[PDB]
Every structure is written in structure tokens, then in C-alpha cells.
Design an enzyme around this catalytic site. Structure first.
Site, mmCIF file in Angstrom:
data_model
loop_
_atom_site.group_PDB
_atom_site.id
_atom_site.type_symbol
_atom_site.label_atom_id
_atom_site.label_comp_id
_atom_site.label_asym_id
_atom_site.label_seq_id
_atom_site.Cartn_x
_atom_site.Cartn_y
_atom_site.Cartn_z
ATOM 1 N N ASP C 47 -7.878 -32.683 16.364
ATOM 2 C CA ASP C 47 -8.691 -31.661 16.985
ATOM 3 C C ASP C 47 -8.184 -31.436 18.460
ATOM 4 O OD1 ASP C 47 -9.783 -31.039 14.598
ATOM 5 O OD2 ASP C 47 -11.855 -32.017 15.184
ATOM 6 N N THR C 80 -7.217 -22.518 19.384
ATOM 7 C CA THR C 80 -7.259 -23.046 20.410
ATOM 8 C C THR C 80 -6.073 -24.183 20.971
ATOM 9 O OG1 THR C 80 -8.882 -24.742 20.454
ATOM 10 C CG2 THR C 80 -9.736 -22.567 20.746
ATOM 11 N N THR C 81 -6.571 -25.237 19.801
ATOM 12 C CA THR C 81 -5.558 -25.996 19.480
ATOM 13 C C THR C 81 -3.990 -25.411 19.168
ATOM 14 O OG1 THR C 81 -7.117 -27.530 18.213
ATOM 15 C CG2 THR C 81 -5.043 -28.126 17.875
ATOM 16 N N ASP C 378 -16.184 -21.816 10.608
ATOM 17 C CA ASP C 378 -14.703 -21.248 10.364
ATOM 18 C C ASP C 378 -14.656 -19.979 9.702
ATOM 19 O OD1 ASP C 378 -13.868 -23.643 11.369
ATOM 20 O OD2 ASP C 378 -13.232 -24.533 9.632
#
Lengths: 102, 127, 509, 514
Positions: C47, C80-81, C378
Site C-alpha cells: 500500500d 493513489t499508489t 473498493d
């Protein structure tokens, strides 16, 4: 512990009528008023002593100005003994607390 | 939990009675304000020249003959006497109610909250 | 003060070294990152976000990446990752060439000339998904929820996100805001199990409900939102002196009461039984609601009432002096306060406003509840993405090598200076193949070729590599899909940042 | 700074060897105990993998990482903790050898997964049912204690081991959460572990002639005060002012004296007969004249017990937590077929026994009263944790690494993936298997290989599980040897083995962060 409570009476002692002053202090503003409001329409008296003292505006004018100033003056005498008594009883609080716990 | 609230409950009840005792007694000082106004009311009402039975001293009273209506006291300053006008004195007889009622009445909601502060401790002291 | 070619190279270094380690953590196949602290704290994560927190940043570019990292995280919280992996490339590619070929400016405009060609390619590779077919959403979801690797009770409750989020889809703004997640308001149930966890309409109100404050069960009677403006008026519209002494207690607190009784009536006139009043309540406002024996629920939060304004979907009263059932307590509505496990749970349901539905979350513990909700998170984000753009796109390098050509084809076409930024930007697309070829542990350079070979005819339409299958694949045969929503967002996101840091040559104290 | 690429790996796997090394014999009859004056600084003595982990101060992150995942399996197993540490590093090297050869750790991790399952798949193939009988209970209890202590001390305890677990099968309970009540006796001699089918308390309190031998046991186990604080308290501790602390105590002994009279009829209601024995047990102290007059009633009374005891006695004796000394029901107050206050050393230990529930059952170890007495304690509890698995599963398998070679014989030969990319990890996977038998034997005797080929060939011959004889360092069939793993342990190990060895193999970096 008595050390907590010890100097608080001597404290509130000098605070007691000092509070009474601060109403008189307020009414000293009012007597300045009620002297200025009295042109002589009805008699003006400083009541001091069991004798009624016949009095005048200018006799009471400085006076009520002096009173209000003086009725601010017994404030400072407590302000003297204010931080005398509350501060030393502030040290005493730890003194016999632990000894009696000991 | 409980003993500290057994200890803390002590002062809050006084904070109750500190406020409870004070507010009740200023109506007594207001009694004279309307009184002297009313004492000056009926004073101007009748006339100068009525007999006045006035306190001599305890267990006694002394008569007297009223020659002045418009001559009327106010107590303000410190130890001071202002003899005022009939309407002047009344106005302060009146107005001295007004300021004292403010200092007096403010005490009642603070009375409740000190109990609401004590009553809150009571519960947590019992719970 | 930090300035100049350093910060220029620093705009490279930070976003680079950030993105560098993180692509290994990308993908369902992902290479985890260890942390240690002088404190001893150990962190094993794929993450980026969680990493992006405990890591330290001594460069504001490295700090502002966290910012733009949270941007996509504000937006979704996944990708974002991914976003950081894009610009970190870009500056590490175009700049040292093109800033030593001297410009902030060229690639900046070319970042847009990059941004559009994706969109261009996106209008091809992204192909519509319907929310009518659950699996057609859920296969993306099943792919999206297995990203965090719990398919267990998340998946079936992802239907609930496939429902609640889709069923809190509402509020056309006229360019149609409707596509959304947030209006879905999760339920928290001690006891129950994600099996019996299933939507109720509107918003199921857990938050302020530890116990019934609104009757027990209410069907027809209107759940009613009273919103501030229930405070008294001692005058007509005005407020005079308040209670002081004897008859002011009477007269004034009566003056307070009439105006509110007048406010009260309009509530009772629309036939409530439960009435949820947020802050700005009078005890005057309740007691006539008590005189009608219609419970007035006071001093309860706003979102909760907005949940309740989404629960029966009534509005919030904007003129509490003149009230409508159209205002609050719309439709027939429902209010049901149910103990499920520990806590009484107000269910304000039968929602008007286009449905509305919230995710009922029942775990046995709150853990077996939470594991679902996190992967549920999610879906409900991918649900809104499917709601946002319901065009499922082939995953992997399918979009990557596609846009790359189309950018280099745009290089061939435009043949300007920004052709080079394209070939610099089109180079950024290959991340996913490299990321996946890393995460599969294969040889990229053949698969780089082979994917260019996949674009040579197929145009990499559905064909990227998928490191998770390890091979260059159609993503229809693998059923790998994402909305054009999530793609362009993540795509555009770092492009902006690729502009952003490149803008910054200077730090001043 | 950071450690990336290979550096995020080496230091982790390099640390995983000397770690693995020292305790290479913490294990099996070849196992050797270790001490610590170092980690916690005290005088400490321990044998087990996970247990020697936590005692040390381990500043290398990985050393702390397995301690977690090992503790999971450590819970039920209690052995194999030391074991699972060994195969993982044995695995990590081969994967490292690939990356040394060069290769991708995730496709290598990908290489474990079929092999793990294939071995798991093999694990149900190799699991052979020896159902629960004292033999299997012996041979697993000893091989665990043969691991944890002397085979001497193993068979010394292997009696006490099976002692309690007979009544837990009376409970039909595959686990022991009681009968694990253990008393540690002051003595010179370690080896003496006394089965008491009831409990033991160190008490019988301060007074004798209470009929410390109670044949009809009627037990009041109470926290009521027949004795209590003399300490100065107002709010619960020393108050700022002295005097208000005083008013409390004068109601103490009076409360205690009264409860004496309450026990009189509490003896008379319950019994009325000294011939019917009554037992008080106080969680707090008891004044002498309480016990003294309670001795006058034909009652033994035990001041200052413990919560487990109260509950265990509430359980085992069918006893009570009851709070009062007032007249109470005898049927409430629990029963034991025999009760005696026993003395070895200074303190008088009440042996309460034949209790209504043979549920909380004392295995009473004597001992030097040391870390040694502490040492001999922890193992037998794990000796159970072995045999509970034997009680758990029906399948108990020859130990001493009997399963390991056959898997490497099973797995590698045909590629379990039929695919090299995974076979890479598989070839890595099936080497991890062999270390424990081949490291202990070669520690205990003849080598890995020349011993392997003997265990190999006989497996290669039979496929039957020939284990190691650690009495030599040569293979024998660990069926007859008695060293017997269960299926549970070996099941559990690959899980704890692989999943920790994988995610750490996939560390892409490590960073000091904040």
C-alpha cells in the site's frame, strides 16, 4: 489539612468589608452624583459617629471624593494581605499533608 | 471514582448554598427601597403637619409633627446621608432597586448549575 | 532555501524515488515493502498510501507528492499508489533531456497534449459496462475487491455497494452529478453476519442511534426533519424581553411558546409520529409535538439528518415557519428502529429522492464486519466509477502501449518539438508492463517488443501484459476491467503533478 | 537512508541463519537448552524456539517477525516453533541461491505455492492415523519432551502428561484449558510431578487442627474478609489529613468475629456434623480466631486463594465463588472425595482431590525451586500441546524428520508444477524440508547426506516413513522409535513456514521511516 485552610480566614478577613467598600465605592460615585444632584435642595450629611454632623456639599464634596478614594484604599490593604495569606497557605498545603500521610 | 466524588461533593453543595443564601437576602434590602419610596409616597400624599409616630427605641416609639415632605433621605456613598428631594429620593428609592435586583437575580441560575454540578457528582458518586 | 536545477533534478528525484519502489507494490501481483524504524516499527505493505504516511519527506516535492497522492486518495483512495508512478516517470524522462534541452514550458503543454491522447485512446479501449448486470460491474468489483485479497464475504456485500452506491445515485445537477458514492452511508451492526447484511432503502441510521429516539417502528407516519429555526419568537416575528420575574415566566415563556406552537402545527399538519429535529430545537417545539404525541427528536447531527434527509430522502427545511410534507417526511417513508445484535438501529426507509440505499454491514464481530467493508470500500468506489463512466477498460498494458503509439503516432503526425515529450510521455505508459513484468517476474524487453507487437496490429486494444497472468493477454479473455473513470483520473492526476513539480524550481524561506 | 534491491533481502536472510543456528538443537532428543543473562538481563533458562525469541531483546526486525507467526503455531504445537524457524532459512537460502544465480523472488515465491499445496496435498497422504491411546499419548508426549527436556524427564513427565489428559478425554475435550492447573512444589528434586485429580492450594491457611484431612468436602471459596487492611486509608490511600483514615478499621475485626459465628451455623446448617467436613477458602486473609473457632466447628479454612483456584475449585470441587459466611446451602458448597493439607518444605499445601469435577487437575511438580523448576515446568505443558494435537487429529505420524525426504522424493522428481518457473521455488521449497532431521542427526551423529541416503534409500525403497534415530544420528523408522509428529503440527508448519517466508522474500525495500 488545616494548613490549606489556615490563612484563608485572615485572607477573607481583609477582603470582607473591602467588598462592602466596592458597593460603597459604587455608591461613592452615586453620592458624588447625589451631591452634584443636590444643590442644597435637601440637606447633605456625612454621617460619621453616632452624632449626626450637619454637613455641606463642599464639606462632603472633597469628602465623597476622599471617601471614594479611601473606599478604594481599603482595597490595597487587603491587596497587601491578599498575597500574604493565600501564598503562605500555598506552601503550608504540602507541609502537613504528607506528614499526616506519613 | 466514588470516594473522590464523595470528597468533591462537599464544596458543590456550599456553592449551591453560597448562591442560595445570597440571592434571598437582597430582596430584604429591596424592601426598604420601595418602602422609603412608599414611605415618601404617602408622605407627599397627605401633607406636612401630620403626626408622625416614629421609632424612638426598642419597645417604644415617639410621636412627632411632620414639617417636611420634600425632605427625604438617600443612603449612598459609604456611611453617608444624602437627604434628597421627594422625587429625587423616590428616584433613588426606585433606582436602588434596579441595580440591586441585577446583582440579586443573576444568582439564581448559578444556584441551579452548582446543584447540577453537585447532582452530577451525586450520580457519579453513586454510580 | 532550495532552488534551481537542483530542485529541477529534485522534482525528478523525489517523485522518482517515491514512484520507484512503489510500482513493485502495484498490481494484484505486487512486491511488498518492508519498513523498520529506529523506534523498531516494522511495516509490510503493498500500500503506497500507508507507506506514504510513515515515510519521511525532506523535500517538498516529496511532500507535495503526498499532497497529490492524497488528491487521488481524497478522490478514491486507490490509484493513489498508481498516480505517483506516472509523473515520477515523466520528470525522470522528459526533463533531463528537455530541461537540458531547456524548457519548463514545452512538456507542460505537452502534458496536455499527452492528457488528450489518452482520452482519445480511452474513447476506444474503454468500452461501456452496464450497472444493470451486477457481474458486469461485479467482475470489475471482484477484480477490484480481490486487489486487497479478500473475496470472501466482501464480494456478496459488494453487491450491496453495487446496489447502495448505485441506489444512492441521484441528484442530477443538469450535467448530472448523479454518479457518486458518498451518499451511501454505511451501517454498523454488532451481531448479524455479512450474509444477512443487505440494503434497506434511503439511509439506515446507526450513528446517533444507540437506542430508539424515534418510536420503535413507524411505517406511514412521517419521519420529519426540523432544522434549526425552531427557536422561539416572543413577538410576532420578533423576540422581546425574556422571563425575569413572576408573570414574565407566564407571559414571556408563553410569548415564546405561541410562535413555536405555530411552528409546531405545520409539522403535525403533515402527519408525523417520529420527528427528527437537529440543533435549533425548542422545548416549545417539542411539547406540542408532544401534545400531538408526535415524538420530536432533538439535537442530533447534520449529516445524520442529511442521512435522514437521504433516508426518507426528504429535504432539510429551509423555511421552518412555513412547512410542507414535500419538505420533510416525503412519500410514505418508513422509520424502523431495530435491535440487531447489541444496538437499536433506526431504519428510515421507503425513500423518495431517487430511491436511496445504504450498505447494511453486519459482522459477527466488528472485525468480520470490517474486513468486508474495506474491500466493499473498493466496490463502492468502483461502483461510483462505474456510475461515473460505465466504460470497462482492459487492464494491464492494454491502454499503456495503445496511447504510447497514438502519442508517438501523434509524434509522427505533429513532428514538432512536443513529439519528443510524447516519446518521453508515451514512454511513461510502459510502467504497467514493466510493473507487471516485474510482478510476474518475466523478461520485459521481449514483452515490451511483444506488446508493441500487440499494438502493431491489435493496437493493444484489449492486449496488455498482465503480470498476474504473467503473459501478454487480451483483458477480455482475462476479464480484467476498469472504468474509463478511474483510468483518466489516475492518468490525468500525475500529469497535473508532472506539470506541478516541473513548475517549481525555487524554494524560499 | 534505505536498504534496497538485494540489501533489503540479504540482511534479513543472513540474520535468519545464526538465529536458525543456535537453536538447531533446541529441538528433538538432540535438543539443547539455552539461558539468558543477556536479553532480559536476569538469570533465565529456556528451551523452545519462539520462547527463546521473546526473552532476548531482538533489534533485528525479522527476528521479531517470526516470533509473531511462530507464536500462532507455538500455541497449539509448543514444539516445532524451533523447528519452523529452521526450514524457513533452509528455504530462504535456496531462493537466495536463485537470486544469487539471479532470478525474480516473486516468481520464486510463485514457485512455493504449488509445492506448498503439493506438500500439503502430500501432508494428508503422509498423515497416518494413530488414534488417541496412551501409547500415542506417551510417544508424542515424550518426543515433545524428548525435544523439550531429557528423554529421561520426558518419560518421567510422560506419566504426569497422560495423567491429566485422561480426564480431559472424560471431558472429550481435544484441548486442555484445565487440568493444566499445575503446582510447583518446594523440594530438592525436579522430577516429581504429582497427579492430583482435584486442585492443590498452598493453603490450609495459618491454622492447624482444622481437620486438614477432609473426607466429606464442603467448600466455601469466598473473598469475604476474615482479615483485611490495617493500612491507613481514607480515599483508599493516605489522606492529606490524618484522622479521617482512622474510623474504618474498628469495623474490621468485629466484621470478622461476627462471620465466625456465621460459620458456626454455616457449619451447622451445611453439616451440623464435624464428621461431615466443611472447607472455607478465603481469597483474602483470615484472622486466627476465625480459623481457630472454625477449627472448633470441624472445618478447615483456607485464606488467600487465587481466582483460578476459586474458579477451578468452583469447577473441580463443584465448589463456589459464593460471597458470605452466613448460613449457606451445603449443595452449593462444592465437594471433593478427599481433601488434605500437605506439607513439603515450609508451606502447607492443601491437596483437594477426587473433586466433583475432575476438571481442573493438579500435576504437581517438585523441583529445585529455580529457573530450573521454571524450566521443567514449561516443557510438560507443551508436551501436552503436542499430544493435544494427537488428540486433535486422528493422524499421528513418525517424527524425527520422517516426512521430509518423502516430500522431496514426492515433490521434486516429477515437477509438481511440471513447470520449471515454479519448480525453481519447488526445488527451493523441498530443500527446506530436510534440515531438521539432517541437522539434528548430524548434530546428534552421522551426517546429513550419508544419513539422508539411508533415510532416502529406505524412503526410496519403501516410501514408508523412516525417521531419524537421534539416539545415534542414523535413520530408523520413527514409527517404532516412538518420536511421533501429529498431522496438525506438520499441517500447521508449512502455513507458518511459507506465508512468512514469502512476503519477506518479496520485500522490495526496507527504510528507517517516521
Amino acid at each position: 489539612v488545616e494548613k490549606y485552610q489556615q490563612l484563608q480566614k485572615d485572607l477573607s478577613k481583609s477582603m470582607s468589608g473591602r467588598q462592602k467598600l466596592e458597593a460603597q465605592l459604587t455608591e461613592n460615585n452615586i453620592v458624588k452624583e447625589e451631591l452634584a444632584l443636590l444643590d442644597g435642595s435637601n440637606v447633605v450629611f456625612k454621617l460619621l459617629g453616632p452624632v449626626l454632623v450637619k454637613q455641606e456639599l463642599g464639606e462632603a464634596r472633597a469628602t465623597v471624593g476622599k471617601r471614594l478614594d479611601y473606599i478604594t484604599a481599603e482595597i490595597k490593604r487587603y491587596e497587601s494581605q491578599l498575597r500574604d495569606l493565600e501564598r503562605q497557605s500555598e506552601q503550608q498545603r504540602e507541609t502537613l499533608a504528607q506528614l499526616q500521610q506519613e | 471514582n466514588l470516594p473522590q466524588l464523595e470528597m468533591l461533593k462537599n464544596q458543590l453543595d456550599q456553592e449551591v448554598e453560597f448562591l442560595s443564601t445570597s440571592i434571598a437576602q437582597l430582596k430584604v434590602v429591596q424592601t426598604k427601597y420601595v418602602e422609603a419610596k412608599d414611605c415618601l409616597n404617602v408622605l407627599n400624599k397627605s401633607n406636612e403637619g401630620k403626626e408622625l409616630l416614629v421609632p424612638l427605641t426598642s419597645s417604644m416609639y415617639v410621636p412627632g409633627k411632620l414639617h417636611d415632605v420634600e425632605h427625604v433621605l438617600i443612603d449612598v456613598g459609604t456611611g453617608y446621608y444624602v437627604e434628597k428631594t421627594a422625587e429625587d429620593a423616590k428616584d433613588f428609592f426606585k433606582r436602588k432597586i434596579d441595580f440591586l435586583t441585577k446583582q440579586m437575580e443573576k444568582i439564581q441560575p448559578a444556584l441551579q448549575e452548582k446543584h447540577a454540578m453537585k447532582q452530577a457528582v451525586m450520580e457519579m458518586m453513586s454510580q | 532555501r532550495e532552488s534551481g536545477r537542483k530542485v529541477q533534478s529534485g522534482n525528478i528525484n523525489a517523485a522518482k524515488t517515491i514512484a520507484d519502489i512503489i510500482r513493485t507494490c502495484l498490481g494484484p501481483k505486487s512486491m511488498m515493502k518492508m519498513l523498520l524504524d529506529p523506534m523498531g516499527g516494522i511495516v509490510m505493505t503493498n500500500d503506497g498510501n500507508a507507506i506514504l504516511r510513515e515515510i519521511q519527506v525532506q523535500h517538498p516535492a516529496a511532500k507535495s507528492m503526498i499532497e497529490i497522492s492524497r488528491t487521488q486518495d481524497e478522490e478514491v483512495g486507490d490509484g493513489t499508489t498508481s498516480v505517483i508512478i506516472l509523473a515520477g516517470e515523466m520528470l525522470s524522462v522528459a526533463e533531463h533531456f528537455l530541461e537540458q534541452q531547456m524548457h519548463p514550458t514545452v512538456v507542460i503543454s505537452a502534458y496536455r497534449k499527452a492528457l488528450d491522447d489518452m482520452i482519445s485512446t480511452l474513447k476506444k479501449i474503454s468500452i461501456p459496462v452496464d450497472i444493470s448486470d451486477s457481474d458486469m460491474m461485479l467482475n470489475i468489483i471482484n477484480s477490484s475487491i480481490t486487489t486487497k485479497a479478500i473475496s470472501r464475504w466482501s464480494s456478496l456485500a459488494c453487491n450491496i455497494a453495487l446496489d447502495a452506491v448505485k441506489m444512492v445515485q441521484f441528484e442530477e445537477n443538469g450535467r448530472k452529478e448523479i454518479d457518486i458514492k458518498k451518499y451511501a452511508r454505511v451501517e454498523k451492526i454488532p451481531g448479524g453476519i455479512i450474509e444477512d447484511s443487505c440494503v434497506l432503502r434511503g439511509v439506515m441510521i446507526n450513528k446517533d442511534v444507540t437506542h430508539p429516539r424515534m418510536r420503535r417502528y413507524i411505517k406511514n407516519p412521517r419521519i420529519v426533519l426540523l432544522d434549526s429555526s425552531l427557536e422561539y419568537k416572543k413577538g410576532e416575528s420578533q423576540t422581546d424581553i425574556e422571563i425575569t420575574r413572576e408573570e414574565d415566566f407566564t407571559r414571556i415563556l408563553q410569548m415564546e411558546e405561541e410562535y413555536i406552537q405555530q411552528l409546531c402545527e405545520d409539522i403535525i399538519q403533515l402527519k408525523p409520529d417520529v420527528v427528527i429535529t437537529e440543533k435549533g430545537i425548542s422545548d416549545l417545539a417539542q411539547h406540542y409535538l408532544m401534545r400531538a404525541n408526535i415524538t420530536a427528536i432533538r439535537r442530533v447531527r447534520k449529516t445524520d439528518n442529511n442521512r435522514i434527509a437521504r433516508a426518507c430522502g426528504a429535504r432539510i427545511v429551509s423555511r421552518p415557519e412555513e412547512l410542507r410534507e414535500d419538505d420533510v417526511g416525503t412519500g410514505a417513508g418508513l422509520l424502523e428502529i431495530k435491535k440487531i445484535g447489541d444496538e437499536y438501529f433506526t431504519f428510515i426507509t421507503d425513500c423518495k429522492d431517487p430511491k436511496a440505499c445504504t450498505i447494511l454491514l453486519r459482522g459477527a464481530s466488528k472485525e468480520i464486519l470490517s474486513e468486508v467493508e474495506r474491500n466493499l470500500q473498493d466496490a463502492m468506489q468502483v461502483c461510483r466509477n462505474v456510475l461515473l463512466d460505465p466504460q470497462l477498460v482492459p487492464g494491464g498494458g492494454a491502454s499503456e502501449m495503445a496511447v504510447a503509439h497514438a502519442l508517438t503516432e501523434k509524434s509522427k503526425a505533429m513532428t514538432g518539438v512536443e513529439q519528443w515529450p510524447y516519446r518521453a510521455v508515451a514512454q511513461a505508459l510502459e510502467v504497467i508492463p514493466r510493473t507487471l513484468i516485474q510482478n510476474c517476474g518475466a523478461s520485459t524487453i521481449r514483452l515490451l517488443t511483444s506488446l508493441r507487437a500487440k499494438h502493431t496490429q491489435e493496437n493493444c486494444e484489449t492486449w496488455g501484459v498482465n503480470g498476474e497472468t504473467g503473459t501478454l493477454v487480451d483483458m477480455k479473455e482475462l476479464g480484467i476491467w476498469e472504468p474509463l473513470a478511474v483510468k483518466l483520473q489516475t492518468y490525468k492526476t500525475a500529469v497535473e503533478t508532472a506539470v506541478l513539480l516541473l513548475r517549481i524550481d525555487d524554494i524560499v524561506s | 537512508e534505505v536498504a534496497r534491491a538485494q540489501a533489503a533481502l540479504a540482511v534479513n536472510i543472513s540474520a535468519a541463519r545464526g538465529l536458525q543456528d543456535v537453536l538447531r538443537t533446541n529441538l528433538g532428543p538432540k535438543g539443547t537448552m539455552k539461558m539468558l543473562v543477556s536479553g532480559a538481563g536476569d538469570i533465565k533458562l529456556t528451551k523452545d524456539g519462539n520462547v527463546l525469541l521473546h526473552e532476548m531483546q531482538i533489534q533485528h526486525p525479522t527476528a521479531s517477525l517470526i516470533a509473531k507467526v511462530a507464536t500462532a503455531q507455538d500455541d497449539i504445537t509448543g514444539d516445532g516453533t524451533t523447528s519452523n524457524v529452521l526450514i524457513i532459512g533452509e528455504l530462504l537460502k535456496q531462493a537466495d541461491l536463485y537470486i544469487s544465480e539471479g532470478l525474480h523472488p516473486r516468481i520464486i515465491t510463485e514457485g512455493f505455492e504449488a509445492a506448498k499445496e503439493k506438500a500439503l496435498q502430500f501432508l494428508e497422504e503422509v498423515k497416518v492415523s494413530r488414534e488417541m491411546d496412551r501409547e500415542t499419548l506417551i510417544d508424542v508426549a515424550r518426543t515433545s519432551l524428548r525435544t523439550k527436556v531429557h528423554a529421561e524427564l520426558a518419560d518421567v513427565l510422560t506419566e504426569a502428561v497422560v495423567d491429566s489428559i485422561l480426564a480431559i478425554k472424560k471431558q472429550d475435550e481435544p484441548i486442555d484449558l484445565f487440568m493444566i492447573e499445575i503446582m510447583e512444589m518446594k523440594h530438592k528434586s525436579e522430577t516429581d510431578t504429582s497427579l492430583i485429580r482435584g486442585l492443590v492450594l498452598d493453603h490450609g491457611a495459618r491454622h492447624p487442627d482444622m481437620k486438614k484431612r477432609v473426607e466429606d468436602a464442603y467448600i466455601l471459596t469466598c473473598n469475604v474478609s476474615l482479615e483485611y487492611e490495617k493500612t491507613e486509608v481514607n480515599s483508599g490511600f493516605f489522606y492529606k489529613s490524618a484522622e479521617e483514615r482512622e474510623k474504618l478499621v474498628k469495623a474490621e475485626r468485629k466484621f470478622i468475629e461476627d462471620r465466625v459465628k456465621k460459620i458456626i451455623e454455616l457449619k451447622r446448617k451445611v453439616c451440623g456434623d464435624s464428621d461431615k467436613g466443611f472447607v472455607v477458602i478465603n481469597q483474602k486473609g483470615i484472622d486466627p480466631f476465625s480459623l481457630d473457632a472454625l477449627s472448633k466447628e470441624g472445618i478447615v479454612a483456607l485464606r488467600r486463594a487465587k481466582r483460578r483456584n476459586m474458579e477451578r475449585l468452583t469447577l473441580a470441587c463443584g465448589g463456589v465463588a459464593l460471597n458470605s459466611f452466613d448460613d449457606l446451602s451445603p449443595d452449593c458448597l462444592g465437594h471433593a472425595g478427599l481433601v488434605y493439607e500437605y506439607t513439603l518444605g515450609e508451606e502447607k499445601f492443601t491437596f483437594i482431590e477426587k473433586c466433583n469435577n475432575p476438571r481442573s487437575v493438579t500435576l504437581l511438580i517438585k523441583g529445585p525451586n529455580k529457573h530450573t523448576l521454571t524450566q521443567i515446568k514449561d516443557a510438560v505443558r507443551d508436551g501436552l500441546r503436542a499430544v493435544k494435537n494427537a488428540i486433535d487429529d486422528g493422524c499421528v505420524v513418525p517424527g524425527a524428520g520422517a516426512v521430509e525426504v518423502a516430500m522431496a522424493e514426492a515433490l521434486i522428481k516429477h515437477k509438481p508444477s511440471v513447470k520449471g518457473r515454479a519448480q525453481l521455488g519447488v526445488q527451493a521449497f523441498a530443500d527446506a524440508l530436510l534440515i531438521i532431521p539432517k541437522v539434528l542427526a548430524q548434530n546428534s551423529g552421522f551426517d546429513l547426506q550419508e544419513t539422508l541416503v539411508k533415510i532416502q534409500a529406505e524412503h526410496s525403497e519403501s516410501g514408508q516413513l523412516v525417521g531419524v534415530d537421534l539416539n545415534t544420528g542414523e535413520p530408523m523408522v520413527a514409527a517404532e522409535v516412538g518420536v511421533w509428529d501429529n498431522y496438525c503440527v506438520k499441517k500447521q508448519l508449512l502455513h507458518s513456514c511459507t506465508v512468512i517466508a514469502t512476503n519477506i522474500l518479496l520485500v522490495d525495500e526496507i527504510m528507517r521511516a517516521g
